[PDB]
């Protein structure tokens, strides 16, 4: 009748939670219910993570769908792969091979490094934080040297007190007249970062900013003020998509009572993705089902030693790597390493009527534009 | 007391630095009760069960190691449950309670290095991973000093090492910071002699503290303008001593302790046992009854309360011994300060000791 999986959900993640539920009725069938179990938790806190998971095993979930960050994420990793329990997240993807994991996030690095030479790029700035990992930063080192790039690579994560060090930034960011920066961090010091441009200095319009993420378009964004900048980033959900369309027909028109973070015209991709594992999920289950192939009985401490891996577990993995279908954010399917495979990223510039689609990139490593 | 002992599979002259010490300082007021494991430090499942069977035993301080894939369950755990964890492990970035980090910090000498040989164009090989905080640390100073770096994270390979080197002679700069483990240093080291003309003008910076440590003097160089670091000073007679019962133990009762030096890690080991010594001989002292165990299970009861936990963190942060590393004494945090890193060049004669980097100030020719 029903099968149990698990919600390990960040605090604050409102949006990400509706999306969550308003998939849990968009893909219900009279076949099965989803029955999840939720856990509002600080995913940067590792303990705590490795508690909520303990929690859910304890409990029998076959599956669980929840988020991490670079500070977690070995823990669900290690865990889930030891247990041979399945994490469906989100987050950033993993560099290097992890069985158990399946990630709904499409790479960025390939679509970013073509977007730096279609741009003809070969001095610019390169402002990390390390919070989505810093395989990005990898990538961007190995290109500049075998391309040729003279780049200055700064882990702007660090920040305090003393807006003199913010401003010091800028200062030395025109020891070569850059202009040219790319933004690899959070939203916060990205607003903080290009204020003090606006602010503190000139020539404002003379920049040229590439936002590393895929949520360009999600509202927060746009707002900040580049002044006359060109600004460039990324989009993997697209609002002229047939399938998005509809969606965000019901969702623009949900009770923001009832589903906090809803009511709205766009939606971040993050809970774009979560609505996507939602419908995942269940075609995985239902291609288990279809096999006859038992759910399924102990399941006790999962710091249990010698630990004993559900037997069940490798052929759920198995469903949910297997399954393709048409999501929200476009193609969606995965390699043996649960990683994304054959999706497009559209590429964003900001123009005067608004965010332009100039073109896209495909998983074939291929840059294409538009007419 | 009951302290944990955490060790990565066949760590052996690490572990056996710790016998050598726990016995050459268990005089008089108490023997510890380590307790040991021998776990894969990679794996955050096994860590989180080592650390917590401990947690069990009702151990108020863990000794042990992490690696760039634990080191994250062991700072949660360690802060949430409020037991101490020594190391000899690489220091942390950002501040961590709850942590002594027994290593001193090396991003600081090696940027003084640089300035030293007044570098403004060099390569950097940088191995996944002792925390890469390092080649940030200095491509977070390559804006400021004007440096252009090369950055080439030496983590992957899989054949291509002639491909480095011989595109890095597209602008015939032949500058080089080979920062990685024992193993991927050897390995590229003679790839430079191999297909490698002209492999003598160039200058080699090992970014790690066991320049001596391990095999030096088992590479030709060729150039071989070689420089590095040292943390363990063997005209010392701490160390001499220490060597001379170390030069002279059993290979089968002590692996690994049986040479005329060691590698800074294990000294380190060492150092930590005399270090979590001094503490609780500081607790004692000033009458402070610490108690008190059978805490049940990490996930489902209590931290050691607090104000008891701070008790021994505090005592193990206030000591302020003399080592083999040289004097130790920690900061708020459990960072190591007050310490020196001596600068080492590559000779005809051998290695010497040229210089030495205050962790007060910075570099100073000898």
């Known amino acids: 009748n029903s099968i149990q999986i698990g919600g390990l959900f960040p605090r604050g993640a409102d949006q990400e939670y509706s999306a969550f539920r308003v998939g849990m009725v968009q893909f219900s069938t009279s076949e099965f219910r989803l029955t999840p179990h939720i856990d509002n938790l600080e995913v940067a806190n590792s303990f705590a993570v490795t508690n909520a998971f303990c929690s859910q095993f304890s409990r029998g979930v076959y599956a669980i769908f929840g988020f991490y960050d670079k500070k977690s994420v070995n823990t669900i990793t290690s865990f889930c792969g030891t247990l041979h329990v399945s994490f469906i997240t989100p987050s950033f993807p993993t560099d290097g091979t992890h069985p158990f994991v399946i990630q709904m996030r499409p790479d960025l690095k390939g679509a970013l490094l073509s977007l730096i030479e279609y741009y003809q790029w070969d001095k610019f700035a390169y402002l990390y934080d390390s919070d989505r990992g810093l395989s990005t930063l990898q990538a961007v080192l190995d290109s500049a040297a075998e391309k040729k790039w003279q780049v200055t690579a700064i882990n702007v994560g660090n920040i305090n007190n003393d807006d003199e060090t913010y401003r010091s930034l800028f200062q030395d960011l025109e020891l070569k007249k850059e202009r040219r920066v ?171 009527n608004g965010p332009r689609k100039i073109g896209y990139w495909s998983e074939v490593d291929k840059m294409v534009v538009t007419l």
């Open 182 to 352: 790319i933004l690899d961090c959070e939203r916060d010091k990205v607003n903080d970062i290009v204020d003090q441009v606006i602010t503190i200095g000139k020539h404002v319009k003379g920049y040229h900013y590439i936002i590393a993420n895929l949520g360009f378009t999600d509202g927060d964004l746009l707002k900040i003020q580049f002044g006359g900048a060109n600004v460039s980033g990324f989009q993997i959900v697209d609002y002229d998509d047939s399938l998005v369309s509809k969606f965000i027909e019901r969702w623009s028109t949900l009770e923001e009572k009832e589903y906090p973070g809803a009511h709205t015209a766009t939606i971040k991709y993050t809970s774009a993705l979560t609505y996507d594992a939602v419908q995942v999920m269940t075609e995985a289950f239902r291609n288990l089902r279809k096999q006859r192939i038992e759910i399924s009985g102990n399941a006790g401490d999962c710091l249990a030693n010698p630990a004993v891996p559900w037997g069940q577990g490798v052929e759920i993995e198995r469903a949910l790597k297997q399954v393709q279908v048409e999501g929200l954010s476009g193609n969606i399917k995965f390699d043996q390493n649960g990683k994304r495979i054959n999706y497009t990223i559209n590429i964003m510039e900001l123009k005067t």
